Amino acid sequence: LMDDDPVLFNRQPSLHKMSMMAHRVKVMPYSTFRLNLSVTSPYNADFDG
Amino acid sequence: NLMGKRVDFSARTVISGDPNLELDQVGVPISIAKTLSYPETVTQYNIHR
Amino acid sequence: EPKVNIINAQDDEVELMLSDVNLSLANSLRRTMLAEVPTLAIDLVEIKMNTSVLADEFISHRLGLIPLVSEDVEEMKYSRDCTCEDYCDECSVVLELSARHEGEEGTTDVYSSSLIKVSGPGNLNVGEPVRRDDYDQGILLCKLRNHQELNIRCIAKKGIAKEHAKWSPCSAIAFEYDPHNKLKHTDFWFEVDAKKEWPDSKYATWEEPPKPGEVFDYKAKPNRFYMTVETTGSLKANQVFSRGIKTLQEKLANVLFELENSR
Amino acid sequence: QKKAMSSRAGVSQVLNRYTYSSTLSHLRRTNTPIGRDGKLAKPRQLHNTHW
Amino acid sequence: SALFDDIFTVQTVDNGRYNKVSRIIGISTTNSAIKLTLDINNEMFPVSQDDSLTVTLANSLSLKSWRPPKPTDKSLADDYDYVMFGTVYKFEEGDEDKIKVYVSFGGLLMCLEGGYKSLASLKQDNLYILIRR
Amino acid sequence: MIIPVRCFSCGKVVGDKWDAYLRLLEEGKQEGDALDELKLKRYCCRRMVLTHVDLIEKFLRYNPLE
Amino acid sequence: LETDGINLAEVMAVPGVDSSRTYSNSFVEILSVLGIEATRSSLYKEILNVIAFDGSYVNYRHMALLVDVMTSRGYLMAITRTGALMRCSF
Amino acid sequence: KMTLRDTFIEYEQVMNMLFWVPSWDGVVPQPAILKPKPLWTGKQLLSIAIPSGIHLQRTDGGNSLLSPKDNGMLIVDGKVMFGVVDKKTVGSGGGGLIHTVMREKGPKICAELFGNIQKVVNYWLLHNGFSIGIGDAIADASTMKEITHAISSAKEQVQEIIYKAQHNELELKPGMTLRESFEGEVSRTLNDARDSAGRSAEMNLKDLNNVKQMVSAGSKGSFINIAQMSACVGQQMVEGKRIAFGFADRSLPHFTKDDFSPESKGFVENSYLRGLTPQEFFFHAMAGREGLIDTAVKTAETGYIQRRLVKALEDIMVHYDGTTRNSLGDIIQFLYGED
Amino acid sequence: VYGWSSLVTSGVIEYVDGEEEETIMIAMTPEDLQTRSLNDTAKRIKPEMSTSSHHTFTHCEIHPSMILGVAASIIPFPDHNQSPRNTYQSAMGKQAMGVFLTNYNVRMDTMANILYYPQKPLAKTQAMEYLKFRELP
Amino acid sequence: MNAPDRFELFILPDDVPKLKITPDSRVPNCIIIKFEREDHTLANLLREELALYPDVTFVAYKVEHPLFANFVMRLQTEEGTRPKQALERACASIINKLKTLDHKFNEEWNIKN
Amino acid sequence: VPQIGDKFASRHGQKGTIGVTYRHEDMPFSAEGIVPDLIINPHAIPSRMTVAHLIECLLSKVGSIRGYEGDATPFTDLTVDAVSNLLRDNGYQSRGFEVMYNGHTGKKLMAQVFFGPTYYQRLRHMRFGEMERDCMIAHGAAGFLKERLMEASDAFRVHVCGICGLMSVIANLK
Ligand SMILES: [Mg+2]
Ligand SMILES: [Zn+2]
Ligand SMILES: [Zn+2]
Ligand SMILES: [Zn+2]
The missing domain is CATH 3.30.1360.10 (RNA polymerase, RBP11-like subunit)
Known part of the structure; x- marks a missing residue:
């Protein structure tokens, strides 16, 4: 998997159609997915685990 | 009743924020990137890389 | 100006x-x-025999934080700058610690003063653990009971705080x-x-x-x-x-x- | 074991050992065996008598 | 050169809710019916009540990337103490000879009330305001 | 478990002052005075020394396996 | 007037009452009295009231589609719950 | 914080902030102040990140074009003329800057706007600083006295209502009994008291108060949070009523029988800063447990309803003739949305 | 030996269950036993206690902080928090990391987590004395 | 596993150059410099040293993401000079300042000895 | 060893994971050179109204300065003003604010920072269903539905005679 590769990304539950979206991959070290802050609100997610 | 196959086209893990990412970008660990794979067909343009 | x-x-x-x-x-x-x-800090720890209640990585990590005299650390070279296999006398300092408690009573306190500089790039003034005074025991490393022994060989190398604190x-x-x-x-x-x-x-x-x-x-x-x-x-x-x-x-x-x- | 049907489950649990306070909390726990005859919210409310 | 020039007496100075910005109101001494409501910086140009200010409005400082001005070069700003640059965002041609000019120097607002003869040349896009004393 | 070698926040060597701290507490000196006599100015070192629990004294009670 | 209980025909038949504007919140008897189109209008009104009580906004087209689905058959349809291979799979 | 009127940036910080914009064109704007020292306002460096050709007008509270309170918003050619930028502009509401850029430029420019604004604002906040402390929840002596006076007056009014009710001198609301009318009047009085105390606490707050900055920005918190942290927690609320008499005609054994005083049935005069008395603590715990249970059942009910709704309208699709039909081919709407 | 049972049998402390609490009058603190005849904004506001001219108390609480459980006794200043936060902290407390026992070396459990350098909290409560928290933090 | 080695934060691989230079054609006489295995310690010093020069019209630096030990700097001078020569001038000036500072500190310490 | 993604929590339900780790020189520092072990977001405070977190931080700072452990027992006579007076008697700001310097540049921060010790504990914990199908149906990407229904299932190619319809087909692709 490489940079700029479109990948589908989802949070459960997927109540609405933009709870699952296509993003562009950026490969970076360490063991957490990284997201922009502004897309956390449509995902209805926080970084508490 | 069915068993026997090797599918590794999905992943799930914890997330964190990153202000230095675009709205459509997602950070991916190197281990997760190596675990997943994309099948690309060899052409004349992409043969070298 | x-x-x-x-x-x-x-x-x-x-x-x-x-x-x-x-x-x-x-x-x-x-x-x-x-x-x-x-500066000079312990970076490789070879534990020959450990019978204490502390874990091997625990005592190794505690040994890593011991300050060492690094007055002449400039003349030494980095590990990657030395063509010798593994480590040699010109790029590392070899120290040893051997402690034991004898008798059915009491507890033996192993301090940093027990560390002895076995070998180093002579005649540079490095490797010695830092002592506040001549009589000061120093940092408390471990505690040993009856029939508990510690035998460790440590290697100290040159580094910077960017790599590790x-x-x-x-x-x-x-x-x-x-x-x-x-x-x-x-x-x-x-x-x-x-x-x-x-x-x-x-x-x-x-x-x-x-x-x-x-x-x-x-x-x-x-x-x-x-x-x-x-x-x-x-x-x-x-x-x-x-x-x-x-x-x-x-x-x-x-x-x-x-x-x-x-x- | 012959009467596993209608046998109350969860009475005995593996003792928690994550930390001392967790063990103490586990040793002082009470469980209410709901039997579909409750009114949902009513058994889950914090009553005045619980003072 | 200079599109407008006048001398104003400050009626009131309003510090308001800000510690660094004061909104002042001034009346031209030479002629009434010309009012100036301007937001200025306290630290750069401290002002007091009942002060005389020489106000000039121009379109260029000559006698697009910005640069720190070299000491060798000179401009109109050498003749004044407080120079600001801003964008004209409203030109209200109201009833009869009531004309309003609304200019925003990076969020610091200026409203000029006056007749057509004084404000005819101010129909520009960007303006430099120069205040002396 | 045992006194840490260095202060977590700043990095001052505090592992050599545990015995001195206990001895100072033996004479009935207050904890603040004992910390002051050890020249622990920043409160990071003060919380490093003050809040430590010497659990190893329990671990040494059990008979060794060899 | 706001009256507890539902009896639409008798209320509309009462003199002094505007029989052309009487409304009810029970759309079943609205269908039984007024008709299917009035039922669609009343059910849309009810769903809009429920949605907009708290101040939220939902586009009209979604609710219009929902009410049209619910009233497409000429009667109210509640939102509530062959192949040999599937027959043998069962 | 950056788009405030009295925010000025030095030249070097302006260059650093400008270089942080991926879409910057390499032309440094002229500073708002030229003499005796160059100075840029925060509005200029925010307008740097806004693409050109964007216009937006918003009027807040009938503000004039002169904008004495710096409210409203005016953006001309991708430049902010006046108005503090807050949730009213860069939020998710309709008609905002994001919506305008979406409708005007397109998805790519709208996506890049997020990154530009975030980078600029994050650098400025990194080199400016922001925090919150305990002192932000403390009111002065005068406001505390005013809050205490309001609470005491409300308690006296509640006592008067109790006295009127106990002598059959309370007006009966139509279609509802005397006891629930009395309870409703008491609840209304207590709610008005809490609102008044919180309002006084809010008008106390200085502009340097970090909680007030958060509330004004809209990022987190609201007026009720300030009211509960500084002035009064308020009446604890159970199943649409006050605290019921769990014991024999008394909420707790520490109260005498038939006690309708506000403290007896779950009114928390103290704020979170002051601390809660044990009875208030227990009543607050009861209210919190009820809220947790209600949320836990409501989410399940909504999930079931949503799943059933999706199952109902799964096979509805707009065809090429403009009609809206199901899988069977039956027409649901002759035109999608009638338009 | 003079202990808790000696206190109980001497008639100064007695046990009451939930059903007996219906018929007794309880005071929060000993200070509530004696009615006073101040005006400080820092302290909290006690109940007025003006429904009755005089109160005939039959029992007094030993300490209100004893109404909490073992998990809630770890929270410093629980009276300054919202109740859902207290519930969340109580739930998350069991997932913490610490020294569960001093004989962890000789035991063989399926999973065990041991912190190197536990420290007693700088802000403690009285109940922490009886939970051995300052000795096994 | 996913965390890179710590020594790579300062030890530069031989294949990757220490310093990379590209031009910027949007405005005249402007260059972009990529520094590897560096951070704010050198970056801020060089930037604010260059910002005081009369012939420097624009100087800035940024670190795109903290997990990568590299930064970038944009530098544009006037027509009379070139950005490179200004860069060596700034480096030499800082070297001289540090040498003077060390000499003065040594003298003061010897006095206080 | 703690790293990115590991969870930690205070004693008031303020759980959070590590986002990034900064070295000693990159952290903000007070006038005495003290750098924080943790930096937490202020926005977590006003929504949850955890005033006890701030009070515990202030009391811990006072206790560490004076050399004792504070008493945070509920339903006591302790007030915030008393702790503030105790802190102010020790040469610090009464509300716990401190003047902090930016790590990168050394310039003073415009806003003072709440700064002090606090008790933190490390936490232990280190499918394509129906709703995803509905979401992708709403997006209208039928190809992805086909791929999920085949690749995430037991799909396999089978050659069948068009006349007999039995399993009697031998195929040579080359
Ligand atoms: Mg979460
Ligand atoms: Zn060697
Ligand atoms: Zn320290
Ligand atoms: Zn065939």
Whole structure:
């Protein structure tokens, strides 16, 4: 998997159609997915685990 | 009743924020990137890389 | 143009005033002391036999944080700079520790003074653990009961605090400027009165307070920085300051050489 | 074991050992065996008598 | 050169809710019906009530990337103490000879009230305001 | 478990002052005075020394396995 | 007037009452009295009231589609719950 | 914080902030102040990140074009003329800057706007600083006295209502009994008291108060949070009523029988800063447990309803003739949305 | 030996269950036993206690902080928090890391987590004395 | 596993150059310099040293993401000079300042000895 | 060893994971050179109204300065003003605010920072269903539905005679 590769990304539950979206991959070290802050609100997610 | 196959086209893990990412970008660990794979067909343009 | 005034000077810490320099230069110098001053620290631990109640990685990590005398650490070379296989006498210091408790009573305390410098790049003055005095036992390493023994061989190498904090030669660097907030670099939170609700800086007497009728000086820039440097005993404070200046100079010289060679 | 049907489950649990306070909390726990005859919210409310 | 020039007396100085910005109101001494409501910086140009200010409005400082001006070069700003640059965002041609000019210097607002003869040349896009004393 | 070698926040060597701290507490000196006599100015070192629990003294009670 | 209980025809037949504007919140008897189109209008009104009580906004087209689905067959349809291979799979 | 009227940036910080914009064109704007020292306002460096050709007008509270309170918003050619930028502009509401850029430029420019604004604002906040402390929840002596006076007056009014009810001198609301009318009047009085105390606490707050900054920005918190932290927690609320008499005609054994005083049935005069008395603590715990249970059942009910709704309208699709038909081919709407 | 049972049998402390609490009058604190005849904004506001001219108390609480459980006794200043936060902290407390026992070396459990350098909290409560928290933090 | 080695934060691989230079054609006489295995310690010093020069019209630096030990700097001078020569001038000036500072500190310490 | 993604929590339900780790020189520092072990977001405070977190921080700072452990027992006579007076008697700001310097540049921060010790504990914990199908149906990407229904299932190619319809086909692709 490489940079700029479109990948589908989802949070459960997927109540609405933009709870699952296509993003562009950026490969970076360490063991957490990284997201922009502004897309956390449509995902209805926080970084508490 | 069915068993026997090797599918590794999905992943799930914890997330964190990153202000230095675009709205459509997602950070991916190197281990997760190596675990997943994309099948690309060899052409004349992409043969070298 | 730059001027240095030393306020207090002793073996482990130095408090001074730095004037006629830019703020970024002082901040970079402080960062250079904090991170990029090479010292000597234990980096490889070979445990021959351990019977204590502490884990092997526990005692190894505790051994890693022991300060070592790094006065002549400049003459040594990095591990990747040495063509010898693994490690040799010119790029590492070999120390050994052997402790045991005898008898059915009492508890034996293993300190850092038990560490003995088996070998090193002679006749350089490095490798010895730092002792406050001649009679001081030093850092408490472990505790042993009856029939409990510890036999460890350690290798000490040269590094910088960027790689791991155990090579950091400084503990805390106090750094401040503009005690009276003449430049208005900060806005003071208050409930009734800002002046009464905020303690005076310890250097408030070194600069005259502003007069009530004074107007703001928009062309003024920070010029005097009061800083106190404390060391862990691996290097004296004057040595730390000089080596930080030398490290920054070497970095700038390397950049200059790269620019010249780029043509 | 012959009467596993209608046998109350969860009475015995593996003792928690994550930390001392967790063990102490586990040793002082009470469980209410709902039997579909409750009114949902009513058994889950914090009553005044619990003072 | 200079599109407008006048001398104003400050009626009131309003510090308002800000510590660095004051909104002042001024009346031209040479002629009434010309009012100036301008937001200025306290630290850069402190002002007081009942002060005389020489106000000039121009379109260029000559006698697109910005640069720090060299000491060798000179401009109109050498003759004044407080120079600001901004964008004209409203030109209200109201009833009869009531004309309003609304200019925003980076969020600091200026409203000029006057007749057509004084404000005819001010129909520009960007303006420099120069205040002396 | 045992006294840490260095302060977590700043990095001052505090592992050599545990015995001195206990001995100072033996003479009935207050904890603040004992910390002051050890030249622990910043409160990071003060919380490093003050809040430590010497659990190893329990671990040494059990008979060794060899 | 707001009256507890539902009897639409008798209320509309009462003199002094505007029989052309009487409304009810029970759309079943609205269908039994007024008709299917009035039922669609009343059910849309009810769903809009429920949605907009708290102040939220939903586009009209979604609710229009929902009410049209619910009233497409000429009667109310509640939102509530062959192949040999599937027959043998069961 | 950056788009405030009295925010000025030095030249070097302006260059650093401008370089942080991926879409910057390399032309430094002229500073708002030229003499005696160049100075840029925060509005200029925010307008740097806004693409050109964007216009937006918003009027807040009937503000004039002169904008004495710096409210409203005016953006001309991708430049902010006046108005503090807050949730009313860069939020998710309709008609905002994001919506305008979406409708005007397109998805790519709208996506890049997020990154530009975030980078600029994050650098400025990194080199400016922001925090919150305990002192932000403390009111002065005068406001505390005012809050205490309001609470005491409300308690006296509640006592008067109790006295009127106990002598059959309370007006009966139509279609509802005397006891619930009395309870409703008491609840209304207590709610008005809490609102008044919180309002006084809100008008106390200085502009340097970090909680007030958060509330004004809209990022986190609201007026009720300030009211509960500084002035009064308020009446604890159970199943649409006050605290019921769990014991024999008394909420707790520490109260005498038939006690309708506000403290007896779950009114928390103290704020979170002051601390809660044990009875208030227990009542607050009861209210919190009820809220947790209600949320836990409501989420399940909504999930079931949503799943059933999706199952109902799964096979509805707009065809090429403009009609809206199901899988069977039956027409649901002759035109999608009637338009 | 004079202990808790000696206190109980001497008639100064007695046990009451939930059903007996219906018929007794309880005071929060000993200070509530004696009615006073101040005006400080820092302290909290106690109940007025003006429904009755005089109160005939039959029992007094030993300490209100004893109404909490073991998990809630770890929270410093629980009276200054919202109740859902207290519930969340109580739930998350069991997932913490610490020294569960001093004989962890000799035991063989499926999973065990041991912190290197536990420290007693700087802000403690009285109940922490009886939970051995300052000895096994 | 996913965390890179710590020594790579300062030890530069031989294949990757220490310093990379590209031009910027949007405005005249402007260059972009990529520094590897460096951070704010050198970056801020060089930037604010260059910002005081009369012939320097624009100087800035940034670190795109903290997990990568590299930064970038944009430098544009006037037509009379070139950005490179200004860069060596700044480096030499800082070297001289540090040398003077070290000499003065040594003298003061010897006096206080 | 703690790293990115590991969870920690205070004693008031303020759980959070590590986003990034900064070295000693990159952290903000007070006038005494003290750098924080943790930096937490202020926005977590006003929404949850955890005033006890701030009070515990203030009390811990006072206790560490004076050399004792504070008493945070609920339903006591302790007030915030008393702790503030105790802190102010020790030469610090009464509300716990401190003047902090930026790590990168050394310039003073405009806003003072709440700063002090606090008790933190490390936490232990280190499918394509129907709703995803509905979401992708709403997006209208039928190809992805086909791929999920085949690749994430037991799909396999089978050659069948068009006349007999039995399993009697031999195929040579080359
Ligand atoms: Mg979450
Ligand atoms: Zn070697
Ligand atoms: Zn320390
Ligand atoms: Zn066939």
